[PDB]
Design a protein around this ligand. Structure first.
Ligand SMILES: Nc1nc2c(ncn2[C@@H]2O[C@H](COP(=O)(O)OP(=O)(O)O)[C@@H](O)[C@H]2O)c(=O)[nH]1
Ligand SMILES: *S(=O)(=O)c1ccc(S(=O)(=O)Nc2ncccc2Cl)cc1
Ligand SMILES: [Ca+2]
Ligand SMILES: [Cl-]
Length: 168
C-alpha cells in the first residue's frame, strides 16, 4: 500500500493530539499528556484506494535541531495546527512553516493550515480573514476544524493525503 507520512505540528494546546485521536479512534480526548509524542498508523480508503496513513503527533519535546529536522525530513505532508482561540499559536505557525521549508526545500510540500477549536467561536482570537490571507500568502489551503465536534477532521487528513498523492 501507499504509505502517507503525515506530521502534526503546532504550538502547545492547539489540538494536535485531540485531532489525531478523533481521527484514529472517534473520540474527543481532552487530557492527552502534553509532552507525549506518538505515531499512529491506520489503513484508510482514500478516493477508493486502500492506503496507509502514518501520523506523527509531535509534542514539542525534541529540542535537538538535527533530530527535529530529521523527523521533518521523513514527513511527506504536514498539518500545521493552531487554535483559533490563541493568537500566539497562529503567529507560531510561521515558525513551523519555515522549519519545514528549510528541510523539505519545496514550497509546495503538502501542507494544510488548520485552525482548530472552531466550536469555540465566542473565544476566537484569530479572524477567518487573517488566516485565509496567510494561507493565500503561502499557497496552502486553510481549513477550520473541531476535534470536539469532529468538524472537518476527516477532511484535513484526507485532503492532506490527496496532496501527498498528487505531488509526490
Ligand atoms: N473545545 C475544544 N477543545 C479542544 C479542541 N481541540 C483540543 N481541545 C482541548 O484543548 C486541550 C489541548 O488539546 P491537545 O490536543 O492536547 O493539544 P496539543 O498540545 O496540540 O496536542 C485539550 O484540553 C483538548 O480537550 C477543539 O477542537 N475544541
Ligand atoms: S522519536 O521518534 O524518538 C521522537 C518523536 C517526536 C518527538 S516530539 O514530538 O516530542 N518533538 C518533535 N519531533 C519532531 C519534530 C518536531 C518536534 Cl517538536 C520526540 C522524539
Ligand atoms: Ca499533544
Ligand atoms: Cl513515535
Amino acid at each position: 500500500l501507499a504509505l502517507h507520512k503525515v506530521i502534526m505540528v503546532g504550538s502547545g494546546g492547539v489540538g494536535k493530539s485531540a485531532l489525531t485521536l478523533q481521527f484514529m479512534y472517534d473520540e474527543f480526548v481532552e487530557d492527552y499528556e502534553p509532552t507525549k509524542a506518538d505515531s499512529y498508523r491506520k489503513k484508510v480508503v482514500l478516493d477508493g484506494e486502500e492506503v496507509q496513513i502514518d501520523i506523527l503527533d509531535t509534542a514539542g519535546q525534541e529540542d535537538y535541531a538535527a533530530i527535529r529536522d530529521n523527523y521533518f525530513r521523513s514527513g511527506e505532508g504536514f498539518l500545521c495546527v493552531f487554535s483559533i482561540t490563541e493568537m500566539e499559536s497562529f503567529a507560531a505557525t510561521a515558525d513551523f512553516r519555515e522549519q519545514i521549508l528549510r528541510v523539505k526545500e519545496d514550497e509546495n510540500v503538502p501542507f494544510l493550515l488548520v485552525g482548530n477549536k472552531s466550536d469555540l467561536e465566542d473565544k476566537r482570537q484569530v479572524s477567518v480573514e487573517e488566516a485565509k490571507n496567510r494561507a493565500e500568502q503561502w499557497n496552502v489551503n486553510y481549513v477550520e476544524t473541531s476535534a470536539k465536534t469532529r468538524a472537518n477532521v476527516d477532511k484535513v487528513f484526507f485532503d492532506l493525503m490527496r496532496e501527498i498523492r498528487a505531488r509526490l
